[PDB]
Design a protein around this nucleic acid. Sequence first.
RNA 1: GCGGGGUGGAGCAGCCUGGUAGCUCGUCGGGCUCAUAACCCGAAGGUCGUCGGUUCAAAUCCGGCCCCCGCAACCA
RNA 2: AGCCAGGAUGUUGGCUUAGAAGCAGCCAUCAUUUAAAGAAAGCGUAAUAGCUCACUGGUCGAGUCGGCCUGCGCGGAAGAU
Lengths: 68, 361, 38
Amino acid sequence: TPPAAVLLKKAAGIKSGSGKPNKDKVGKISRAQLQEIAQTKAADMTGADIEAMTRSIEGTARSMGLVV
Amino acid sequence: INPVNNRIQDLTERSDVLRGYLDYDAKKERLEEVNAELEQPDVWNEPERAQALGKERSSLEAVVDTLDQMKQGLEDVSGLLELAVEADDEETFNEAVAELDALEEKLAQLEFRRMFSGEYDSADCYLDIQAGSGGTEAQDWASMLERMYLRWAESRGFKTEIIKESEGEVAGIKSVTIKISGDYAYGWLRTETGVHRLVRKSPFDSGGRRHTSFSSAFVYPEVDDDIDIEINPADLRIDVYRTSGAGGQHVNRTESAVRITHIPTGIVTQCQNDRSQHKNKDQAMKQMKAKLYELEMQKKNAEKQAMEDNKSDIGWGSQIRSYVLDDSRIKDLRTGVETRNTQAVLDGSLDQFIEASLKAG
Amino acid sequence: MKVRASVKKLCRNCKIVKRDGVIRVICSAEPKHKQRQG
RNA sequence: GCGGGGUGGAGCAGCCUGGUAGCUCGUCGGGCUCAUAACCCGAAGGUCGUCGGUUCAAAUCCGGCCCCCGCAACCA
RNA sequence: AGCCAGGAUGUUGGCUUAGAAGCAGCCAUCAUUUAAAGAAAGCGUAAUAGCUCACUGGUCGAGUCGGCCUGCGCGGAAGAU
Ligand SMILES: [Mg+2]
Ligand SMILES: [Mg+2]
Ligand SMILES: [Mg+2]
Ligand SMILES: [Zn+2]
C-alpha cells in the first residue's frame, strides 16, 4: 500500500505541518476522514479490527503534528 | 477581471524572464547531467565531488521544481479564473484571487532573491555624493542629486539622516554623506554607484551656454565594528633578559628587559625602560596590542584606498546615467533605459532604472 | 594509551583492571579508551 | 607617587568663595550685491566627562570611575 | 553472569536538511502484534544498511546487585656531589 504520511497530507490539504507542533498547531484533521483513509489500506495493514488501524493512523497523524 | 488577466500576463512574463535569465533550458540540462552522474556508482568515489553534486542537484532541483510547479499553477489559475468569470461565482472568484495572491507572493520571494543575491544587500547603506567637473554647476547638480535620492528614499519608506554635508560657497553642496536605513537598503541603492552626467543651460554662465556637469554617487553598506579579540597567551612568546647598559650589581644580575613575540604574525615588541620586570611586561603587552591593532587598521585602510583608486574619476568620460534637460531625455548607459519625464525622475522616480539594473544583474 | 590521574570507563566495553599495582582501563571495542593511571 | 584639566559646533572664562553659564569665532533668519565673500541688522545653541554623595540648593564642595595632560620614577 | 532462542507493526513519526531511515538535530514520541521487542541506550552507515542492546521466552541451579557509615592501604608523586 502507499505510505500513510502522503495520504495524511492529501487528506489534510497541507504541505508542511511539523514545525513546532505543540507550541502552535499547524493543521488539524477529523476522525471520520482518518477512518475512511484507514479502510482503503486494509489489505496490507496488519490487523482485523479496522478500529485499531484507525487509531494507529490517528497516532501517526499526531506524530506528524496535526491534532485530531 | 481584466486587471486579473493583466496580473496573470505579468506573472507569465516574470516567470519567462526568470527562466531565461536563469537559462531554464541550460539549468534543466545541467540538472539532468547531474542526475546521470549521481546515478552512476563512480560519483560517490570522491566524497567531496558527491556532496558538491548533491548540493548542486538540490539547488537546481529547487529552481527547476519551483518553475515546473509555478507554470502549472499559473495555467490552473487561468482556467479556474475563466470558469469563475463564466459562471459568475463570487466565492470561486475570491478563491482564485487568494490563490493568485499567494502565487504572486511566491514568485515575488523568488524574484527578491534573484534581485538581491549579494551578501550585504540586506544591510543599511551610506550614500556619498561628490561634485565634479562642473565646478559650481557641478555642486548645484550634486545638491539636485541629493534631493532626488532623499525623495526616492522617502518613497520607499527608508529612513535618512545626513551624516555630513559640505556646502559649496557659491551654490549647492561640495559633498554629502547620507545614512539610509531600511529593508535591503543597500540592495536597492547599490546599483546607483557611478558618475551622473548633467547637461543643461548653465544657470551660472553669464552667456547661458549649454554646459555639462558631473556628480558622483557612491553607495557602501553599513558595517558592524569588529569584535575586539584578546591576545591569546598561547600565541605569545615572552623572553626576559638583562637590560643593555646595565649599571650596578643589581642591574647586571636581574632579568628586567622583556620581549614579546606574536607567533602567528612574527611582530615583536620589547620594553626595558622600567626597573620592574612586571612593569616592562605590562608596557610590552600594551605595545603588542597596539601593534596588532595598527596592523589591522593598516589592512583596512589599504582596502579603503583600493576602493578610492577603483572609484571612477568624476570626469567627462565616466557616466552611468545621462540627464540631458534641453533634449528632455534621461538615459542609463548600462541598461539603455530611457525616459522623457525628467521632472519625475528628478523628483524621485528612480525605480525604473533601479529595477532595470537589478533585473539585468 | 592515555596516562593520567583520573582513569574511568568511557564506554560499556571498558573494564577496570589492576595489573602490577597500577589501575588500567582496557577496552575491547575502542583502542582510544586504553588508559593507565599515572 | 605628586599635580592639573574635561563647560553651546571650536577655542577659552565662570569653580576658588554653592544660588547667577560669559567672550571670540562658528550656525540660523533678514538686509547690501547681477551674484558670492566682506559688511550691516537680528536670533538660536551647553541642564557643565560619568556616576554617585553633601546640601533647602552643586558647573562650583566631596568620593569613585573614564579620558587627557604634566611632572616624578632614584642609590641599584 | 554467561548461555540459547528471540529482540516485531503502522513506521524511515514528520520537518530542516544536502541527506537524516532509533541513533546531525529539530521534533513529536503514540497505538498495534504480545512472551517481549525503545518512535530507541550504545556501536556503526554519506545515507540506508549493518552491529548491538533495553525488553522477553527456554535450559543450568545458589546466590546476586549497588549504594550508606567506618578502619587500614593504592595511584596522582619530576632536580640537580
Ligand atoms: Mg548652578
Ligand atoms: Mg647613577
Ligand atoms: Mg598516597
Ligand atoms: Zn571503551
